[PDB]
């Protein structure tokens, strides 16, 4: 399951958000 | 959205946090 973004976006979201996950629009 | 903002460029850890649930 390789990554799409040069920034390693998906893997960085697992670290920041953990297990509650993320949505595509920021809240602030 | 997050793909348009944080995929070509690295986004801060503060910035990524604003996208969490």
């Amino acid at each position, epitope marked *: 399951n390789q990554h799409l973004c040069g920034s390693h976006l998906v893997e960085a979201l697992y670290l920041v958000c953990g297990e*509650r996950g993320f*949505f*595509y*629009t*920021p*809240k*602030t | *959205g*997050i*793909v*348009e903002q944080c995929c070509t460029s690295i986004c801060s850890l503060y910035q990524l946090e604003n996208y969490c*649930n």
Partner: antibody
Amino acid sequence: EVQLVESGGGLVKPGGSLKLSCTASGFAFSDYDMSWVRQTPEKRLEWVAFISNGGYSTYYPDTVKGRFTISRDNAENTLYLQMSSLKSEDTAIYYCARQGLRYFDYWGLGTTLTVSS
Amino acid sequence: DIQMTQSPSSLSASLGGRVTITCKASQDINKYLAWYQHKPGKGPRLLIHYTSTLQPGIPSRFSGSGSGRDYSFSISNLEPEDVATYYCLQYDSLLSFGAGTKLELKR
């Protein structure tokens, strides 16, 4: 001024299809994530579909996932919702809504859908 | 996707008076709560975001407050065009609406 104008609502038989349109003006449409939200006859607001500003990302609740498809044409400042295999629980007023941040900040005036035999 | 319990379902108030609505979240929502006004035949209109920050152009007689799980919305000096249905929306974890509060005129 910011304007959103929905159109295409009508009466559809159960199992039918219908494509809704939303016309945007008064702002840079391609910078904004957009959603469709519906109000049911019992006056509940229901998030129906979401698409990110460049169209890369999409989200649907399980109640419509697989039957609805949201899409956009940024050169024509238009948002669309293609609905299919329609059911009576889909009957509602359907609104277009802009998401600069995650909370909605502008809505259209709505277009009405009725699903009935 | 958190459950918002809005109450009361309906209220009656007099011109010049004052009304208060509450929203209770099923879990902590970190002050990411917005409030909308909805009149028959129009689309909803955003009043307040981040619990108490007024949207530009919205009169100052509207206000909100709260933290954690417990929030409230208020109208000072009720004007006749304030008659409407009001909704809350949490947007900390995805997004979800309260059931609404129908505001009518005392007489």
